[PDB]
């Protein structure tokens, strides 16, 4: 298996051209300040392979590089575009990225490498990046021949699947997804992980000082209920203790020893004070993992800054993701969890961080897609929806929703946009299946066109195979037809959720691009650091607060034209925390 290329030893006029694949290879996972350990080129003059050393060393390379008009197809661009941005070199001309393409013709796929793109079309010239290069720790550059070939049958699979892709996508109506929305968004997330985001370290030293005193105590008192000391982690030892030496009763029987899960000790929580210690145990013991010691792992030593990687194609709903640092599963819950956030602050002296985040966004895409009349009224009115809902389903008057009431009709809330069942929300509000059931039907008699809407999309997930986005994502829904009911209820779950999760990841996705443009039209340096939840985070120099407090918030509210207005939180202060 061997393909023809021209092991070049020097960039040529030939390898310029105006239209090509590109291939700038980055075999580290972790691809910030990573080696780039070959470049393939595959154009109309034919195939080429560069030392980056030498190409990288050369001017109209470089220059190539950085034209916009040239315009060059990749797989992942936005890892070679950070990669190349370490060194000082600016990417221009992407005008198609496989792996975008291939996330929005289906985000089911997994589509690890240019491999599995091309299998989506029945390209099988190619190997996969692991045959290459190995798993894990092996993940080994090979030697010139073995490299080269592989990343000129990558730039080469590239060249020849573009048009099918495109095809499909203009078929889908996502051509515009990719090019408008997908593909600008990248050079955006590129920019902000490589600006990368300051850590007090200090402060978040403090913060673990403080946990691991935290932790010491619930450890301490757990033995103290125990009676004896003993590996609260081993869950063999844990087992014992609870099930045999307190006595405790077996919730459900398990083949081997009991079980300690979250769930059985949830439901064993009433017998005995030793279990809420042990949860809270485990809660603080998971902060102080991947919160203290996992964030302080991946800060850079010089600069104190965490640079993290978003994973742009992982999601079915359309929601970016985001790893080392993964800031979106900050527990929030958690008041040290919640504080974790004090450690981020910004890059510069006298500059301030600005967070903006949009209030109930997918129950205002709800209420849009569903056009419930009542949904939409208490949006115009900017009501608290959770006191609203609860006056509906309670039938009571506002002056007699109590905080249990509002605290229960919220969890409704977020179970209705969930495309929960009755037993999911009656395990969330700790009833029974009955009682949450009558909840979801008082819900579905005072909101009508919700109750319509969820019944509509599940069974046009069933005509069509997929349900859509706003801005015409697709998620296939495949198990839809399953007789089993575990499958065939999550597939229906995904058809109720995907619509409001994915049209609301569209929503801010769009945000960020209309931001990006319009704080450089507004001649600000202030930049776009983080994207978590429903939120933007940004930093700018202290003296463009008052111009972003009105800027952020009418970019965010005008990003799409709903039927109810989307409502922007917006706030600034000395740390991420503190944005609020």
């Given at each position: 298996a061997k393909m023809a290329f021209t092991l070049a030893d020097r960039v040529t006029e030939e390898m310029l051209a105006d239209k090509a694949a590109l291939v700038v290879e980055v075999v580290e996972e972790n691809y910030h300040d990573a080696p780039i350990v070959g470049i393939a080129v595959v154009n109309e003059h034919g195939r080429f392979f560069l030392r980056p050393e030498t190409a990288l060393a050369d001017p109209q390379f470089v220059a190539w590089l950085g034209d916009e008009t040239k315009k060059k197809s990749m797989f992942d661009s936005k890892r070679a575009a950070v990669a190349l941005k370490w060194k000082g070199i600016e990417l221009c001309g992407?005008?198609?990225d496989l792996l975008l393409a291939a996330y929005l013709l289906d985000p089911a796929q997994g589509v690890d490498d240019v491999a599995a793109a091309a299998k989506m079309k029945q390209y099988e010239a190619v190997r996969p990046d692991e045959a290459v290069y190995g798993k894990g720790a092996k993940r080994a550059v090979p030697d010139e021949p073995v490299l080269a070939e592989h990343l000129v049958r990558k730039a080469a699979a590239i060249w020849e699947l573009e048009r099918p892709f495109l095809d499909e996508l203009r078929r889908n109506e996502q051509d515009r997804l990719l090019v408008e929305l997908e593909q600008p968004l990248s050079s955006i997330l590129a920019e902000m992980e490589f600006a990368g985001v300051k850590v007090d370290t200090k402060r978040l030293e403090q913060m673990g000082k403080e946990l691991a005193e935290q932790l010491g105590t619930v450890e301490q008192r757990i033995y103290e209920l125990a009676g004896q000391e003993f590996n609260i982690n081993s869950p063999k030892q844990l087992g014992v203790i609870l099930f045999e030496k307190l006595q405790l009763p077996v919730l459900k029987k398990t083949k081997t020893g009991y079980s300690t899960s979250a769930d059985v000790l949830e439901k064993l929580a009433p017998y005995h004070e030793i279990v809420e210690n042990i949860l809270h145990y485990r809660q603080l013991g998971k902060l102080q993992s991947t919160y203290i010691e996992g964030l302080l792992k991946v800060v850079r030593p010089d600069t104190k800054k965490v640079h993290t990687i978003f994973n742009q194609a992982l999601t079915q709903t359309g929601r970016l993701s985001s790893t080392e640092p993964n800031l979106q599963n900050i527990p929030i819950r958690l008041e040290e969890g919640r504080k974790i956030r004090q450690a981020f602050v910004p890059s510069e002296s006298d500059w301030l961080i600005f967070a903006a985040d949009y209030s109930q966004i997918e129950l205002r895409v709800l209420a849009h897609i569903a056009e419930d009349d009542n949904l939409m009224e208490a949006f115009r009115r900017d009501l608290d929806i959770h006191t609203k809902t609860a006056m509906d389903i309670f039938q009571v008057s506002e002056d007699e929703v109590t905080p249990n009431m509002r605290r229960q009709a919220k969890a409704v809330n977020f179970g209705i946009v969930y495309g929960i069942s009755d037993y999911g929300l009656a395990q969330n509000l700790n009833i029974s299946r009955k009682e949450a059931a009558e909840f979801i039907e008082r819900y579905f008699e005072s909101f009508p066109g919700v109750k319509r809407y969820m019944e509509n999309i599940v069974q046009e997930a069933k005509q069509k195979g997929y349900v859509t986005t706003l801005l015409h994502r697709r998620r296939y829904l495949p198990?839809?037809?399953?007789?089993?009911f575990n499958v065939r209820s999550f597939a229906e779950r995904m058809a109720m959720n995907t619509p409001i999760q994915g049209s609301a990841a569209d929503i801010i996705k769009k945000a960020m691009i209309d931001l990006n443009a319009r704080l450089k039209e507004e001649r600000l340096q202030a930049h776009l650091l983080l994207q978590v939840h429903d939120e933007l985070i940004l930093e700018a120099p202290k003296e463009e607060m008052e111009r972003l407090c009105r800027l952020v918030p009418e970019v965010m509210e005008q990003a799409v034209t709903l039927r109810v207005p989307l409502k922007v939180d917006y706030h600034y202060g000395s740390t991420w925390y503190d944005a609020k």
């Open positions: 992407v005008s198609f198990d839809i037809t399953s007789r089993n």
